[PDB]
Amino acid sequence: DTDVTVLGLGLMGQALAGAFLKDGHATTVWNRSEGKAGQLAEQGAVLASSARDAAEASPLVVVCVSDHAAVRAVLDPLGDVLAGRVLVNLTSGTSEQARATAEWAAERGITYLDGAIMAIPQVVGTADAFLLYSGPEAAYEAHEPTLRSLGAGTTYLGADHGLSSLYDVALLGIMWGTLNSFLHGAALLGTAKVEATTFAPFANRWIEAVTGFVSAYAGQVDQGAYPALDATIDTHVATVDHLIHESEAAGVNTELPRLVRTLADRALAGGQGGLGYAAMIEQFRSPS
Amino acid sequence: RDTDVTVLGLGLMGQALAGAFLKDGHATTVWNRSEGKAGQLAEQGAVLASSARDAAEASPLVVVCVSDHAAVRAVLDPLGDVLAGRVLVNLTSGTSEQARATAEWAAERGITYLDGAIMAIPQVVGTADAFLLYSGPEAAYEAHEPTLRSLGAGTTYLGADHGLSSLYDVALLGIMWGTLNSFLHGAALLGTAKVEATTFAPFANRWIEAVTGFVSAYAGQVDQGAYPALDATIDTHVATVDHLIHESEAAGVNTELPRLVRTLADRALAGGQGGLGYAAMIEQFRSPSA
Numbered sequence: 001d002t003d004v005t006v007l008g009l010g011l012m013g014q015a016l017a018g019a020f021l022k023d024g025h026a027t028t029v030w031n032r033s034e035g036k037a038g039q040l041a042e043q044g045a046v047l048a049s050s051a052r053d054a055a056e057a058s059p060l061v062v063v064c065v066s067d068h069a070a071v072r073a074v075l076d077p078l079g080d081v082l083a084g085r086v087l088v089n090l091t092s093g094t095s096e097q098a099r100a101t102a103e104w105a106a107e108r109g110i111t112y113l114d115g116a117i118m119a120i121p122q123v124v125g126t127a128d129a130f131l132l133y134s135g136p137e138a139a140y141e142a143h144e145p146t147l148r149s150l151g152a153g154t155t156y157l158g159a160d161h162g163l164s165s166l167y168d169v170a171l172l173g174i175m176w177g178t179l180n181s182f183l184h185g186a187a188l189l190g191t192a193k194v195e196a197t198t199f200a201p202f203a204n205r206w207i208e209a210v211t212g213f214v215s216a217y218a219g220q221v222d223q224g225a226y227p228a229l230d231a232t233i234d235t236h237v238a239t240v241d242h243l244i245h246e247s248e249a250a251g252v253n254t255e256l257p258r259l260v261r262t263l264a265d266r267a268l269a270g271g272q273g274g275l276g277y278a279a280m281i282e283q284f285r286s287p288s
Numbered sequence: 289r290d291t292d293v294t295v296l297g298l299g300l301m302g303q304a305l306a307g308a309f310l311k312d313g314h315a316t317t318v319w320n321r322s323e324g325k326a327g328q329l330a331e332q333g334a335v336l337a338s339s340a341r342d343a344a345e346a347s348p349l350v351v352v353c354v355s356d357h358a359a360v361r362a363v364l365d366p367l368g369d370v371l372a373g374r375v376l377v378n379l380t381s382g383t384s385e386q387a388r389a390t391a392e393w394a395a396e397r398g399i400t401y402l403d404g405a406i407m408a409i410p411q412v413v414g415t416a417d418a419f420l421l422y423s424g425p426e427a428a429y430e431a432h433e434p435t436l437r438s439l440g441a442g443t444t445y446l447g448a449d450h451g452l453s454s455l456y457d458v459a460l461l462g463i464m465w466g467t468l469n470s471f472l473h474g475a476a477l478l479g480t481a482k483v484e485a486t487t488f489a490p491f492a493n494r495w496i497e498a499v500t501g502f503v504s505a506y507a508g509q510v511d512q513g514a515y516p517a518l519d520a521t522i523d524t525h526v527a528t529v530d531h532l533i534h535e536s537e538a539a540g541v542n543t544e545l546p547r548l549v550r551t552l553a554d555r556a557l558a559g560g561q562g563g564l565g566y567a568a569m570i571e572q573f574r575s576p577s578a
C-alpha cells in the first residue's frame with residue numbers, strides 16, 4: 001500500500017514521482033514502456049507490474065501521459081479498480097477533453113480532478129512550481145497536502161473540470177509569444193555578435209516591467225475603455241516599424257513584428273490610434 | 289536662468305522625464321514645439337524656454353525625447369553651435385542606423401553624445417524600477433550617471449557603439465508585443481468562460497515569471513548551438529499549440545497568434561527537429577521566410 005500512484009513516466013511523470021518521493025510519500029509508479037523507472041526505483045519508488053496493479057496500490061492516482069487518446073487508452077480498462085479512489089489527470093488537453101474524462105469518471109463513481117502543470121520538470125517539487133486544479137473542491141481539499149509536494153503554487157480553480165485546460169492553453173500561448181520574441185531578439189542581436197546569454201538578463205528585466213503593463217491593461221479590458229495613459233497605439237506602431245527595419249537590415253526573420261503590425265493596422269483602421277495598447281483586445285475577440 | 293538639465297520634447301514621455309529631473313532637485317529647463325504642454329511642469333519649477341535654442345543654451349546636459357529620427361534632426365540641425373561644450377542625450381526611439389547617423393553629426397561638431405533607450409512607461413520613469421540603456425563614450429556616461437539616475441535606478445551602460453541602445457530597444461520591444469498580444473488573446477479566450485481579465489492577470493504574471501527561467505536556459509543553448517530537450521520536446525510543444533488553436537476555435541476567438549506559432553514550429557518539424565528543445569527555434573529567426 002502506498003500514498004500516491006503515478007501513471008506515465010515521461011520527462012514530466014518522472015519529475016512528479018520524484019517530487020512525491022522527496023517529500024517522503026510512499027509512491028508506486030508505472031509506465032507503458034519498461035526501463036524509465038530506474039532512477040525512481042533507486043529513490044524508493046515501487047515499480048508496479050501493470051497499470052491495474054499501480055492503480056490498486058494508492059488512494060490517489062495521478063496520470064501524466066502525452067494526450068487525451070493516451071489517457072483513454074490507460075484509463076478505459078481501470079474503471080472498476082479506480083472506483084473509490086481519487087484520479088488526478090495532469091495530461092495536457094482541451095476543455096472538451098477534460099469534460100469527456102469527467103463524464104467517464106462520473107458514470108463509474110470515480111472522483112476526478114483535472115489539472116494543469118504550469119512548470120517544467122526541473123521546477124516541479126519546488127516553491128516556484130505552479131499547478132491548477134478543477135473538479136470537486138472537497139477532493140482537492142482532501143488531497144492538497146500530498147499534491148502540494150509538486151509545488152507550493154498548487155491552486156484550486158473551481159468545480160468545472162474544463163477550467164484547468166482553458167487557463168492552461170491561455171497561459172501556454174503567453175509562453176510561445178514571449179519565447180518566440182526573445183528568440184527573434186537574440187537572432188537580431190547575434191548579427192552584432194551579442195551572445196544570447198548577454199541579452200537574456202536584459203530581456204528578463206524588461207519582461208518583469210511588462211508584467212506591470214499586463215496588470216494595468218487587464219483593468220482597461222474589464223472596463224472596455226482604453227485611454228493612452230502611457231503610450232498611444234500610433235506611438236507603438238512607429239516602434240514596430242523600427243523593429244521591422246532593423247530586422248530587414250540585419251537579414252533576420254520578420255514574421256513576428258509583421259503580424260504585430262498587421263494586427264495593429266486593424267485598430268488604426270477602427271480609429272483607435274490614439275488609444276492605449278489595451279484596445280488591441282478587440283482584435284482578439286473574433287476570427288479575422 | 290542657468291539650469292542643470294534641459295528636456296526638448298514634452299510628449300507623454302518628455303513630461304515624465306522633466307518631472308523626474310525636477311523631483312530629484314535638478315534645475316530644469318523645458319521646451320516643446322507646440323505651446324501649452326508645460327503648465328504642470330512650470331508649477332513644479334521647470335523654466336519654460338521660448339525656443340529650442342534658448343533651452344539648449346541653458347544647461348550643460350540636454351536631453352531630447354521627440355517622436356522619431358526625422359523630428360530629432362529637425363530639432364537638432366540648427367543647434368550644432370549652441371551644443372558646443374554640452375552633452376547631448378537622445379532618448380527618442382529609432383534604429384541602430386539612425387543612432388549612428390546622429391552620432392556622426394555630433395562627432396563632426398565636437399558634441400559629446402549619448403544615445404539611450406527608455407525601457408519604461410512614463411509613470412515608472414523616476415522610480416527605482418525604471419530601466420534605461422545608454423551607449424556612447426563611457427567617460428561621458430560616468431560623468432552624467434548621477435543626474436541620469438534621476439530617471440531610474442535601472443540606468444545601465446551598454447558600450448561604446450551608439451547603435452547598441454536601439455538594437456537592444458527594438459529586440460526588447462518585440463518581447464513586449466509578443467507577451468502583450470498573447471496575454472490579450474488569453475484574456476479574450478478566458479472571457480468566453482466569464483473569467484475577467486483582472487482575474488486572469490495574476491496567473492499570467494506568475495507564469496511570465498516562470499518563463500524568464502526558460503529564457504535564461506534557452507539562451508545558453510543558443511550560445512552552444514545545441515538544443516537537447518531537457519524539459520520538453522518541440523513535438524510536445526506543438527501538441528499543446530494545437531490544443532490552444534482548438535480551444536480558441538471552439539470559443540470563437542481570433543487564432544492568428546497560435547497559427548503563426550504552429551507555422552514557425554512546423555518549419556523545425558520539417559527539418560527533423562521535433563525531438564529537440566524549444567531553443568532550436570532560434571534557427572527559424574535567423575533568416576527571412578522562404
Ligand SMILES: NC(=O)c1ccc[n+]([C@@H]2O[C@H](COP(=O)([O-])OP(=O)(O)OC[C@H]3O[C@@H](n4cnc5c(N)ncnc54)[C@H](OP(=O)(O)O)[C@@H]3O)[C@@H](O)[C@H]2O)c1
Pocket residue numbers: 008009010011012013031032033036064065066067069070073074090091092093117118119120121519520521524528
Ligand atoms: N515536459 C514538460 O515540460 C511539461 C510541462 C507541462 C505539461 N506537460 C504535459 O505533461 C504530459 C506529459 O509530457 P512529457 O514531457 O512527460 O511527455 P513525454 O516525455 O513524451 O511522455 C509521454 C508519456 O506518455 C506515455 N504515453 C504516450 N502514449 C501512450 C499510450 N498510448 N498508452 C500509454 N502511455 C502512453 C508515454 O509512455 P511511453 O514511455 O511508453 O512512450 C510517456 O509516459 C503532456 O501532456 C505534456 O503536454 C509537460
Ligand SMILES: NC(=O)c1ccc[n+]([C@@H]2O[C@H](COP(=O)([O-])OP(=O)(O)OC[C@H]3O[C@@H](n4cnc5c(N)ncnc54)[C@H](OP(=O)(O)O)[C@@H]3O)[C@@H](O)[C@H]2O)c1
Pocket residue numbers: 230231232235239297298299300301302320321322325353354355356358359360362363379380381382406407408409410
Ligand atoms: N510613451 C511611452 O511609454 C514611451 C516609452 C518609451 C519610449 N518612448 C519614446 O519616447 C518618444 C516620445 O514618445 P511620447 O510617448 O512622448 O510621444 P508623444 O506624446 O506623441 O510626443 C511626441 C513628441 O515629439 C514632438 N515632435 C514631433 N515631431 C516634431 C518635430 N518635427 N519637431 C519638434 N518636435 C516634434 C512633439 O511635439 P508636439 O507636442 O509639438 O507635437 C512631442 O513633444 C518616442 O520616440 C517614443 O517611442 C515612449
Ligand SMILES: OC(O)(c1ccccc1)C(F)(F)F
Pocket residue numbers: 230231235236237238239381406407408409461
Ligand atoms: O514601443 C513603445 O510604444 C513603448 C511603450 C511602452 C513601453 C516602452 C515602449 C514606444 F513606442 F513608446 F517606445
Ligand SMILES: OC(O)(c1ccccc1)C(F)(F)F
Pocket residue numbers: 092117118119120172519520524525526527528
Ligand atoms: O506546452 C508544453 O510544451 C510546456 C513546456 C514547458 C512548460 C509548460 C508547458 C507542454 F506541452 F509540455 F505542456
Ligand SMILES: [Mg+2]
Pocket residue numbers: 191
Ligand atoms: Mg554578419
Ligand SMILES: [Mg+2]
Pocket residue numbers: 511512513
Ligand atoms: Mg560553441
